PDB file of N, CA and C and ligand atoms in Angstrom:
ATOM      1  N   UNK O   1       5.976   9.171  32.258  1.00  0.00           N
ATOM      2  CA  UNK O   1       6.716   8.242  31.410  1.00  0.00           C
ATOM      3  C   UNK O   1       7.184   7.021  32.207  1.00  0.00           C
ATOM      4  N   UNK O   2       7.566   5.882  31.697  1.00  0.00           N
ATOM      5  CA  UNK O   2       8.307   4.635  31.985  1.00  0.00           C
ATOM      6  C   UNK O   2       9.430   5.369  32.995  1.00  0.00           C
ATOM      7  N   UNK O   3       9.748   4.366  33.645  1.00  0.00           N
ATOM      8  CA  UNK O   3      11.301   4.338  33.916  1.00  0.00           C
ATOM      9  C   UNK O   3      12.538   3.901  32.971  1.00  0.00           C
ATOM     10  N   UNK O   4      13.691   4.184  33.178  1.00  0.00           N
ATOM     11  CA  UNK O   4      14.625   4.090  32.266  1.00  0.00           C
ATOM     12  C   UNK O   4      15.090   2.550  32.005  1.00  0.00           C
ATOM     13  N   UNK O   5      15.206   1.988  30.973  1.00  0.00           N
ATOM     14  CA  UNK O   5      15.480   0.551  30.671  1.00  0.00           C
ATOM     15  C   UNK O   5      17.114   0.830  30.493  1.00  0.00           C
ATOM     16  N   UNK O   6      17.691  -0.721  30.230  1.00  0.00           N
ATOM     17  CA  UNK O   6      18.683  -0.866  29.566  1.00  0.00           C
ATOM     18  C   UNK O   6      18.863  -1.483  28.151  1.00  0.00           C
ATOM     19  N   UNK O   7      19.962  -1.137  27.274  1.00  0.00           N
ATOM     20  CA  UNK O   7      20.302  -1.266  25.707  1.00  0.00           C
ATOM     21  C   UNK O   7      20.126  -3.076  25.728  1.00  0.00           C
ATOM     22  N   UNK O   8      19.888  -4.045  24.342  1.00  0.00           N
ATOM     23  CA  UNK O   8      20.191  -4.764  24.375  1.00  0.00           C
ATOM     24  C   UNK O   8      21.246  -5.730  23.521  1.00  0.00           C
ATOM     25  N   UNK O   9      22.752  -6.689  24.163  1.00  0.00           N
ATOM     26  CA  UNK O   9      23.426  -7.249  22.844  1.00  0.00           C
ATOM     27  C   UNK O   9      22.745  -7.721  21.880  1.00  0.00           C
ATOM     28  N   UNK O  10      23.319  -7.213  20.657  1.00  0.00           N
ATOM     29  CA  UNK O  10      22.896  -7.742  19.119  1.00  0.00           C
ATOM     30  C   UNK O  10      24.182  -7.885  18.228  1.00  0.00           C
ATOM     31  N   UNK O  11      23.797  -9.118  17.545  1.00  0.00           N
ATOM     32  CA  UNK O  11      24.989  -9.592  16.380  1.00  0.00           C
ATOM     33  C   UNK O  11      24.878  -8.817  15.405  1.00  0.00           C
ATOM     34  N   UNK O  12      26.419  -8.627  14.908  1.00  0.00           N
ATOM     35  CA  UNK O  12      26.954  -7.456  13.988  1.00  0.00           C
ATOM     36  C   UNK O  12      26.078  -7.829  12.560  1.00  0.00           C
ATOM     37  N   UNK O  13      25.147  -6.652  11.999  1.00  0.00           N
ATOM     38  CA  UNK O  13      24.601  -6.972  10.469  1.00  0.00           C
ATOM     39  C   UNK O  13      23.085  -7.317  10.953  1.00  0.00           C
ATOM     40  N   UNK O  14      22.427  -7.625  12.510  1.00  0.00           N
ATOM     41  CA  UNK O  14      21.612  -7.850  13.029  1.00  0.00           C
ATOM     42  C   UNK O  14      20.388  -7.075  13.405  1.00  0.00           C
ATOM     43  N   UNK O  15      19.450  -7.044  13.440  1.00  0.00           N
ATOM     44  CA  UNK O  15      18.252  -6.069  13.421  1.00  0.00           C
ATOM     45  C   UNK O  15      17.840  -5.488  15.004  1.00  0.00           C
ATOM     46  N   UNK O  16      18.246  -4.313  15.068  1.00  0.00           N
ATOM     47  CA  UNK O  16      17.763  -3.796  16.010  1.00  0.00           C
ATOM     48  C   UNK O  16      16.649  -3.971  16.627  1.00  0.00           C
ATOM     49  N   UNK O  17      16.146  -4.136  17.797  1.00  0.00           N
ATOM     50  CA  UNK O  17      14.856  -4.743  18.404  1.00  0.00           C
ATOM     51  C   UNK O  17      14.544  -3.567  19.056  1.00  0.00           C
ATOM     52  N   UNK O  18      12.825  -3.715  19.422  1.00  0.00           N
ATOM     53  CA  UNK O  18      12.364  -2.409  19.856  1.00  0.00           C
ATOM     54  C   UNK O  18      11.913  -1.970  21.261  1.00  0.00           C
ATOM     55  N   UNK O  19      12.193  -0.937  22.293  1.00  0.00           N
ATOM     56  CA  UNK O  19      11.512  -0.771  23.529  1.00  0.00           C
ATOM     57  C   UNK O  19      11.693   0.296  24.002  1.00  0.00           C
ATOM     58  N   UNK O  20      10.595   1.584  23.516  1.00  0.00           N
ATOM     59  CA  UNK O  20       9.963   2.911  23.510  1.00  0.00           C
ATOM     60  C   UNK O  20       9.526   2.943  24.708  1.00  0.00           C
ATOM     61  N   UNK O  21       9.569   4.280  24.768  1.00  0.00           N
ATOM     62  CA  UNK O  21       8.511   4.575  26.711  1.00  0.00           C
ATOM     63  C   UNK O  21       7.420   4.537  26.048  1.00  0.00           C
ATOM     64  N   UNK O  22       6.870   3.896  26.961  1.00  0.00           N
ATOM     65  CA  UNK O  22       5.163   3.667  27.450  1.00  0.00           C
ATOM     66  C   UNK O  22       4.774   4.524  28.334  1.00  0.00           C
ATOM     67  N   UNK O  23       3.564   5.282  28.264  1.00  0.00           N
ATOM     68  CA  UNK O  23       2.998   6.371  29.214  1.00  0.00           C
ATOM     69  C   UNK O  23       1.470   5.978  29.866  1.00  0.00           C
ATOM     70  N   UNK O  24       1.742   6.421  31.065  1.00  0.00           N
ATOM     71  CA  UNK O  24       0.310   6.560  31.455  1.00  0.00           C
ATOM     72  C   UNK O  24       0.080   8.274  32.898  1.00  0.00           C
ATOM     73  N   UNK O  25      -0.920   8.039  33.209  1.00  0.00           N
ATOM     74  CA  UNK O  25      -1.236   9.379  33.779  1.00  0.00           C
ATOM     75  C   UNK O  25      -1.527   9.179  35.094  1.00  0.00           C
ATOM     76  N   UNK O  26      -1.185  10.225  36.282  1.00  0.00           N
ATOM     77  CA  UNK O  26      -2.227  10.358  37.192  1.00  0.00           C
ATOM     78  C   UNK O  26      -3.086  11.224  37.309  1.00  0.00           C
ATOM     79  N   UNK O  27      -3.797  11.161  37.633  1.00  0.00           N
ATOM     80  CA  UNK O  27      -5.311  11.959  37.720  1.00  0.00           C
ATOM     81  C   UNK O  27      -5.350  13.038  38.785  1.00  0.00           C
ATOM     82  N   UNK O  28      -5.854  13.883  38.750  1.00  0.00           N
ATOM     83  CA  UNK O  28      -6.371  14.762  39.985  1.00  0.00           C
ATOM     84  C   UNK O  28      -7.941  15.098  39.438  1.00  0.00           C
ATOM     85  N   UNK O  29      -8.667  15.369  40.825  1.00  0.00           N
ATOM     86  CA  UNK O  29     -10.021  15.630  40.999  1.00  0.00           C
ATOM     87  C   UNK O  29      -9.925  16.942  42.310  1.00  0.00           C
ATOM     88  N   UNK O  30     -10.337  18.032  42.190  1.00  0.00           N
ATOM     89  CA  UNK O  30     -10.286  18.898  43.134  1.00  0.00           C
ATOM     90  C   UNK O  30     -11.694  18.431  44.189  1.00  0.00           C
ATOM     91  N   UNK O  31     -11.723  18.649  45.356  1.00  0.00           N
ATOM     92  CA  UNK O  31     -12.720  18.415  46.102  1.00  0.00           C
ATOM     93  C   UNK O  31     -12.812  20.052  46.497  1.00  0.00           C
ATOM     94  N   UNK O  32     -14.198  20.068  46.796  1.00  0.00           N
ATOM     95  CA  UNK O  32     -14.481  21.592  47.144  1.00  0.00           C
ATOM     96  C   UNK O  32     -14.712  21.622  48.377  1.00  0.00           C
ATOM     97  N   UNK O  33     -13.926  22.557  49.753  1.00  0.00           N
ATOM     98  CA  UNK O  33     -13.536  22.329  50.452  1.00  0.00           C
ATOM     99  C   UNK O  33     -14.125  23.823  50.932  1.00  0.00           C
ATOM    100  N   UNK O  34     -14.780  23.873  52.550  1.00  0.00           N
ATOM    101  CA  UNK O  34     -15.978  25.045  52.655  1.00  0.00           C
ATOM    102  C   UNK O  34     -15.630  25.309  54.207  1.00  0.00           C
ATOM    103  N   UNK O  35     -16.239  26.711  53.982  1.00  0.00           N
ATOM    104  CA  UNK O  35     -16.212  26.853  55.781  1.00  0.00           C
ATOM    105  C   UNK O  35     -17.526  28.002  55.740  1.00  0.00           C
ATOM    106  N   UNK O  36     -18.600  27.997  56.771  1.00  0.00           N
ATOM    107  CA  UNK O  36     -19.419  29.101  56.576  1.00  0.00           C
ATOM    108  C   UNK O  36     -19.787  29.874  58.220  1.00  0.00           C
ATOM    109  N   UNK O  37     -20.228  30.861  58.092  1.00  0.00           N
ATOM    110  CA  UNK O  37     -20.244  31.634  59.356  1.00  0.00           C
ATOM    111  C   UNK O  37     -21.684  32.664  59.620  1.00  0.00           C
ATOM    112  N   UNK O  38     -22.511  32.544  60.577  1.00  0.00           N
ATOM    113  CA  UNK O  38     -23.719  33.908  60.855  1.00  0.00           C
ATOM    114  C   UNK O  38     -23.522  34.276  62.287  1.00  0.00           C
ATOM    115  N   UNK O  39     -24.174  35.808  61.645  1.00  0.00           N
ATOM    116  CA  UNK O  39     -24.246  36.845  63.546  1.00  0.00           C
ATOM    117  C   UNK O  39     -25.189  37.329  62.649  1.00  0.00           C
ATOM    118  N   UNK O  40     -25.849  37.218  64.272  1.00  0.00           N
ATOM    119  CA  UNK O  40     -27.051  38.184  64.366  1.00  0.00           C
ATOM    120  C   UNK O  40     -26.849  40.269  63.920  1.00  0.00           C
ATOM    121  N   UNK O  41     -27.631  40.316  63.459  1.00  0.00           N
ATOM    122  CA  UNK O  41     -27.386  41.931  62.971  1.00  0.00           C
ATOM    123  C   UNK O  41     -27.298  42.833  65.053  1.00  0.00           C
ATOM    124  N   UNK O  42     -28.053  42.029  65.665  1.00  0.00           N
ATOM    125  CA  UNK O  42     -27.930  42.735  67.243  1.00  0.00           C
ATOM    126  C   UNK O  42     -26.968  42.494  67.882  1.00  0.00           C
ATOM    127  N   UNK O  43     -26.110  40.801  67.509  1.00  0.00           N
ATOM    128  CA  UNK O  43     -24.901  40.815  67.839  1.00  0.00           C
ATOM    129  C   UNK O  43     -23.595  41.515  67.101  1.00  0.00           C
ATOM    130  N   UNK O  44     -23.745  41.515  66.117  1.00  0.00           N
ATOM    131  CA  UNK O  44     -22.582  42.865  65.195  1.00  0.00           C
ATOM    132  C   UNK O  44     -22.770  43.794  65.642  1.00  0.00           C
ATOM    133  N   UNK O  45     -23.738  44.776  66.582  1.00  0.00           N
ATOM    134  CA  UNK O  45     -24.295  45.896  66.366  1.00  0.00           C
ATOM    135  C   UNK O  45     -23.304  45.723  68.276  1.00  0.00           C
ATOM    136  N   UNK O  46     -23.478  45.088  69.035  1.00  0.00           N
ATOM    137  CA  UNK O  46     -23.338  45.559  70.759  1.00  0.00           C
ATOM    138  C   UNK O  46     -21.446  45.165  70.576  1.00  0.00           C
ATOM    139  N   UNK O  47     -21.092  44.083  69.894  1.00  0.00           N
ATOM    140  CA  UNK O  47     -19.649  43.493  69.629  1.00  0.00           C
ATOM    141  C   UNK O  47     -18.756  44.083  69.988  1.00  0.00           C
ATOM    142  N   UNK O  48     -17.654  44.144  70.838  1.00  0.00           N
ATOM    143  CA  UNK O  48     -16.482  45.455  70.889  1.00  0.00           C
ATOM    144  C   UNK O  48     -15.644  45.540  69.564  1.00  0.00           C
ATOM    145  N   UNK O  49     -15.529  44.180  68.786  1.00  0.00           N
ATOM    146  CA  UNK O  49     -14.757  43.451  67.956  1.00  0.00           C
ATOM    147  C   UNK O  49     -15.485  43.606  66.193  1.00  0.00           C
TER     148      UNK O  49
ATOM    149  N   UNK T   1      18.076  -4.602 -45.450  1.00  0.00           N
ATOM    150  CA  UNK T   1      18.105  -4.908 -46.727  1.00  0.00           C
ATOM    151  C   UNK T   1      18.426  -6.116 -47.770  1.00  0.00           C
ATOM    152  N   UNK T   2      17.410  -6.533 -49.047  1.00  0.00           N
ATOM    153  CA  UNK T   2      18.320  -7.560 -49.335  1.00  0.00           C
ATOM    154  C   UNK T   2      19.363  -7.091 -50.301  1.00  0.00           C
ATOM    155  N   UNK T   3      20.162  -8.199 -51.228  1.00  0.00           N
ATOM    156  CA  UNK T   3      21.412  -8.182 -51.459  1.00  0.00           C
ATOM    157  C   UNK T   3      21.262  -7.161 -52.996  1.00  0.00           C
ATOM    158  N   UNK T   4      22.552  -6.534 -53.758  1.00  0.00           N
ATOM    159  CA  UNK T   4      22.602  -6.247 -54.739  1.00  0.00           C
ATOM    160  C   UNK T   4      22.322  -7.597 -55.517  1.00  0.00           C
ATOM    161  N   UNK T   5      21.753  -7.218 -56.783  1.00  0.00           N
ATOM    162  CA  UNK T   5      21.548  -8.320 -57.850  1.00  0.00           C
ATOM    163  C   UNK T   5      21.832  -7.625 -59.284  1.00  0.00           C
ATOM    164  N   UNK T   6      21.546  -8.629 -60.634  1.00  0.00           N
ATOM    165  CA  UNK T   6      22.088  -8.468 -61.396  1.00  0.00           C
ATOM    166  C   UNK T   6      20.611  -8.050 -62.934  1.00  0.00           C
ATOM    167  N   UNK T   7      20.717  -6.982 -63.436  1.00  0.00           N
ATOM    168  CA  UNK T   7      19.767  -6.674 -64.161  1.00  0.00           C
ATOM    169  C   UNK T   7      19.581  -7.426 -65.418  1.00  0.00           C
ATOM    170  N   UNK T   8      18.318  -8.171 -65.745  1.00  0.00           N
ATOM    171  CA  UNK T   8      17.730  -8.904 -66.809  1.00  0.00           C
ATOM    172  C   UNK T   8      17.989  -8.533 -68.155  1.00  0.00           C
ATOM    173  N   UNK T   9      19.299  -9.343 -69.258  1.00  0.00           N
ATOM    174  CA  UNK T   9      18.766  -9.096 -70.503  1.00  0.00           C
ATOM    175  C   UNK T   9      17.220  -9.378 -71.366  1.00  0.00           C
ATOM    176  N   UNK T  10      16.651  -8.349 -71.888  1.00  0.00           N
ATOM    177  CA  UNK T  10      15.904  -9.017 -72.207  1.00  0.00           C
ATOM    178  C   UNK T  10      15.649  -8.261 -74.131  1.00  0.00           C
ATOM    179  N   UNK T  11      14.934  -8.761 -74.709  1.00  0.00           N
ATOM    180  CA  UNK T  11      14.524  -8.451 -76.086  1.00  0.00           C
ATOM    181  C   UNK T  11      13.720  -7.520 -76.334  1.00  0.00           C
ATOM    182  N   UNK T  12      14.369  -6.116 -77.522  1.00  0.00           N
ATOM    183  CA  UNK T  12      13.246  -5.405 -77.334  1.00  0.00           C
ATOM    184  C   UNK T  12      11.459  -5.029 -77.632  1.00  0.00           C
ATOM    185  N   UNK T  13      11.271  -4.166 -76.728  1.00  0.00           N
ATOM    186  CA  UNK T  13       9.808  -4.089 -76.729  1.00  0.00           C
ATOM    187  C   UNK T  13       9.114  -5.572 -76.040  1.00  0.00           C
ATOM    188  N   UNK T  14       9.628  -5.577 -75.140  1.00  0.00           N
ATOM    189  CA  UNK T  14       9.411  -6.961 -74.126  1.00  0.00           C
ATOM    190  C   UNK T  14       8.810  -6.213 -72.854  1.00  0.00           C
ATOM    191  N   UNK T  15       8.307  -6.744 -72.114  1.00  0.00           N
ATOM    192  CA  UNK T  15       7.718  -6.674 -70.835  1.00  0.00           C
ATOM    193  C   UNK T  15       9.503  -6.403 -69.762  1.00  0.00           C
ATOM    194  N   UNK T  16       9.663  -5.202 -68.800  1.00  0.00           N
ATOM    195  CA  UNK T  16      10.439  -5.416 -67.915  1.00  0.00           C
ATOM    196  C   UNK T  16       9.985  -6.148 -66.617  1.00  0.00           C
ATOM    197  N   UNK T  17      10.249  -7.044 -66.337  1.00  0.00           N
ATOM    198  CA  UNK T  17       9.977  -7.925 -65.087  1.00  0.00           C
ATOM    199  C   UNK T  17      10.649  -7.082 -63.866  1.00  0.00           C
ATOM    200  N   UNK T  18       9.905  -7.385 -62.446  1.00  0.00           N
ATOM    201  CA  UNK T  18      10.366  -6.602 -61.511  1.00  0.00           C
ATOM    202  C   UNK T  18      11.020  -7.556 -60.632  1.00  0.00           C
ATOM    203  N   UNK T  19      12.259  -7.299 -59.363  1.00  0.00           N
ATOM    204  CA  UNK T  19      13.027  -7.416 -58.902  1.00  0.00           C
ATOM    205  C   UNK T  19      13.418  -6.665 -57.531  1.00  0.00           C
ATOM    206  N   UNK T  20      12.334  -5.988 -57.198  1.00  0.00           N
ATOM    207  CA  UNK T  20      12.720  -5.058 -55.951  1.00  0.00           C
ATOM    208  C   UNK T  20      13.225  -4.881 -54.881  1.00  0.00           C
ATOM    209  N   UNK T  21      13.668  -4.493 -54.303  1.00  0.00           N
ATOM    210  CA  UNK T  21      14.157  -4.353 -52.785  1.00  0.00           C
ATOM    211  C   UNK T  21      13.425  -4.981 -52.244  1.00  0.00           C
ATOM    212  N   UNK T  22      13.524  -6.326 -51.491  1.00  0.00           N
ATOM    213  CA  UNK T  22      12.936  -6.856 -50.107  1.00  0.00           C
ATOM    214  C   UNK T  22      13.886  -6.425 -48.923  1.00  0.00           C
ATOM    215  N   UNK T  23      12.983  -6.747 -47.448  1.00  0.00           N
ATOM    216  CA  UNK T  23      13.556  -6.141 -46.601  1.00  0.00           C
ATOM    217  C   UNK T  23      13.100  -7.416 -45.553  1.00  0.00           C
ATOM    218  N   UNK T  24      14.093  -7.394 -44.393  1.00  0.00           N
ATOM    219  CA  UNK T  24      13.499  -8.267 -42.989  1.00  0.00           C
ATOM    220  C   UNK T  24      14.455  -7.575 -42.021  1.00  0.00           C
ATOM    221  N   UNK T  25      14.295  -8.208 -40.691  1.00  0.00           N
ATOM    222  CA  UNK T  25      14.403  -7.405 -39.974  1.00  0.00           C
ATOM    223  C   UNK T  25      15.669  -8.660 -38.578  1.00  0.00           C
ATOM    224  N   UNK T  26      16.432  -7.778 -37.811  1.00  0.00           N
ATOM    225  CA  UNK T  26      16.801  -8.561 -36.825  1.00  0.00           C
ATOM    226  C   UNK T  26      16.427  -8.143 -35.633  1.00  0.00           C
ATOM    227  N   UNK T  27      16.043  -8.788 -34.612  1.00  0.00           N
ATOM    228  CA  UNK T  27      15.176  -8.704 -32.974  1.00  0.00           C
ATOM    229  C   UNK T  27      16.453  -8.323 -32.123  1.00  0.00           C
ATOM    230  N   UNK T  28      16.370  -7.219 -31.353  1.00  0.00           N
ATOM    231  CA  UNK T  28      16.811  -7.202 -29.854  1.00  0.00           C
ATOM    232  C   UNK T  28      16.144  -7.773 -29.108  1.00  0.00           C
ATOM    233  N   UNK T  29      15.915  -8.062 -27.810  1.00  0.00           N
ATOM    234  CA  UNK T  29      15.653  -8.073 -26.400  1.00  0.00           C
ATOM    235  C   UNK T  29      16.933  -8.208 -25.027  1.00  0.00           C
ATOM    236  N   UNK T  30      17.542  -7.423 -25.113  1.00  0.00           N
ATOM    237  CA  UNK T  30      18.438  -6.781 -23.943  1.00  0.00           C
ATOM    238  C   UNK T  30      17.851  -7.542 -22.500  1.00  0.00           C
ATOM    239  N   UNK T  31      18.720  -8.141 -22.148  1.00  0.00           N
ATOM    240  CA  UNK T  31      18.952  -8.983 -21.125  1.00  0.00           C
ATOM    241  C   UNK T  31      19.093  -8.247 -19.818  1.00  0.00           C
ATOM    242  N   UNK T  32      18.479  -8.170 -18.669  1.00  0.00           N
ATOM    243  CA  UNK T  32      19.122  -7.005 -17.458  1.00  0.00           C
ATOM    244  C   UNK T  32      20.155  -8.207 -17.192  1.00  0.00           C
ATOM    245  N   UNK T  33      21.336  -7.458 -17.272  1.00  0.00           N
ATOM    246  CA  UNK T  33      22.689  -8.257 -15.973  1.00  0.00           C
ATOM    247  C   UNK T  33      22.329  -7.032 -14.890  1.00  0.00           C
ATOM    248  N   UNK T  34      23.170  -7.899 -13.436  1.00  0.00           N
ATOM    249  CA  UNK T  34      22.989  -7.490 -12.286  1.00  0.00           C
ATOM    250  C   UNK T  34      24.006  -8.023 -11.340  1.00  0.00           C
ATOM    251  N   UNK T  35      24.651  -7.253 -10.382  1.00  0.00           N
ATOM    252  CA  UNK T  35      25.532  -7.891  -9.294  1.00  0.00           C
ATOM    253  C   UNK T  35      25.181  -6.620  -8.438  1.00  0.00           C
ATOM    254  N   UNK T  36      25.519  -7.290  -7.035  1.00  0.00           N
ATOM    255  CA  UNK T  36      25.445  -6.885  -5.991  1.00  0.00           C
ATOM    256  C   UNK T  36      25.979  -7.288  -4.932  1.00  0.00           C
ATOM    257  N   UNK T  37      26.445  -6.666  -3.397  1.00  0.00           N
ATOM    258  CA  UNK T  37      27.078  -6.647  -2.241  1.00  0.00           C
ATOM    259  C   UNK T  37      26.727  -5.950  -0.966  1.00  0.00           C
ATOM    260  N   UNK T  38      26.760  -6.370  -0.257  1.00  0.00           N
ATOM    261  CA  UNK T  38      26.607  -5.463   1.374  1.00  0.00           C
ATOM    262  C   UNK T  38      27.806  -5.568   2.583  1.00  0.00           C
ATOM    263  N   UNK T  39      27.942  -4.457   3.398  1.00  0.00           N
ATOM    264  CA  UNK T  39      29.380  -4.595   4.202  1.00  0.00           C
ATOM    265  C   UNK T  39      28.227  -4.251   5.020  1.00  0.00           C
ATOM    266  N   UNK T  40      28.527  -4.624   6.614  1.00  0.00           N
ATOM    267  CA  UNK T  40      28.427  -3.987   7.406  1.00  0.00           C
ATOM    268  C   UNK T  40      28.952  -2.358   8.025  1.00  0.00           C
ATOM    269  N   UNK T  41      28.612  -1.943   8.845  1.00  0.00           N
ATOM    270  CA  UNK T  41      29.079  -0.460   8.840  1.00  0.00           C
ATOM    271  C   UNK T  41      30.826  -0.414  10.183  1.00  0.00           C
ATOM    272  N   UNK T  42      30.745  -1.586  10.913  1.00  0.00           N
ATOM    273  CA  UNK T  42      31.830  -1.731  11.811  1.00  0.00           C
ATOM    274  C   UNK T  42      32.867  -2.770  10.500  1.00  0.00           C
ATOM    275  N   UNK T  43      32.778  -3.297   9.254  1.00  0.00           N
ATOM    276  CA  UNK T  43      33.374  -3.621   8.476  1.00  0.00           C
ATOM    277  C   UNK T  43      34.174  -2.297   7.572  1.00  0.00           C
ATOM    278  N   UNK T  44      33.471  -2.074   7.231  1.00  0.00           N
ATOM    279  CA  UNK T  44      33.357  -0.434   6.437  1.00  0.00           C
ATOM    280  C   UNK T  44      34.236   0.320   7.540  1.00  0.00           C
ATOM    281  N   UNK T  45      34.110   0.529   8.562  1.00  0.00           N
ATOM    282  CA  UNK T  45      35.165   1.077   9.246  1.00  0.00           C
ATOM    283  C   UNK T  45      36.521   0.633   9.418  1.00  0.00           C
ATOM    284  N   UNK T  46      36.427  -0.887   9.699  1.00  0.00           N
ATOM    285  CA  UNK T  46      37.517  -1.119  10.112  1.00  0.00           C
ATOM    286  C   UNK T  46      38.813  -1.919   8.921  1.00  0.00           C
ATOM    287  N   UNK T  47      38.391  -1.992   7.940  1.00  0.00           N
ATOM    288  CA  UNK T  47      39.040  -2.239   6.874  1.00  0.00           C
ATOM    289  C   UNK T  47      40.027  -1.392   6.158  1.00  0.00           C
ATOM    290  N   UNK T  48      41.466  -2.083   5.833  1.00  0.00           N
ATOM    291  CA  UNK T  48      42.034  -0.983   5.439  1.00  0.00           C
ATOM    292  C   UNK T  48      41.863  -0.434   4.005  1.00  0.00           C
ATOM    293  N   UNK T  49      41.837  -1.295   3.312  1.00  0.00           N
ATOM    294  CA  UNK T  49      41.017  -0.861   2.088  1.00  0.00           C
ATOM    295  C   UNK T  49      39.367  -0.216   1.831  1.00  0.00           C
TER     296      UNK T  49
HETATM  297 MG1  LIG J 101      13.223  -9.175  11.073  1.00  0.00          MG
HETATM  298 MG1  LIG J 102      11.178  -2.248  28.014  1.00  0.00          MG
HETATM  299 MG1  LIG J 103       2.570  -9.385 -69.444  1.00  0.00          MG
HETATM  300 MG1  LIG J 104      17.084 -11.024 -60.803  1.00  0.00          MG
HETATM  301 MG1  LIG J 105      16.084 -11.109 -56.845  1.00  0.00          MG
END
């Protein structure tokens, strides 16, 4: 939403004037974010770990 | 309606002549009257009447 305004003077019997919040958005976009890993089946196999 | 009137001597075995009720009419058309006023609402309050 807007930020907050202030009221404005008007003469008595006089027509109220107009100023509503105005909206707008921010956006998000996720980025896909990776990590990848290989061992050898002979290195898993001797590994202490 | 029109007015009472006065019935024909006449001789007998004579023809009676006719005389009948005529009729006319008088017109309305009703006029709109109108008045009107407005107070303000800080008038309306602050008035002692
Ligand atoms: Mg106006
Ligand atoms: Mg404004
Ligand atoms: Mg005749
Ligand atoms: Mg007559
Ligand atoms: Mg007559």
């Amino acid at each position: 939403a807007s930020d907050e305004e202030f009221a404005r003077p008007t003469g008595q019997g006089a027509e109220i004037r107009d100023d509503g919040e105005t909206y707008t958005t921010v956006a998000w976009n996720a980025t896909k974010l990776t990590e990848g890993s290989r061992v050898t089946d002979e290195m898993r196999d001797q590994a202490m770990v």
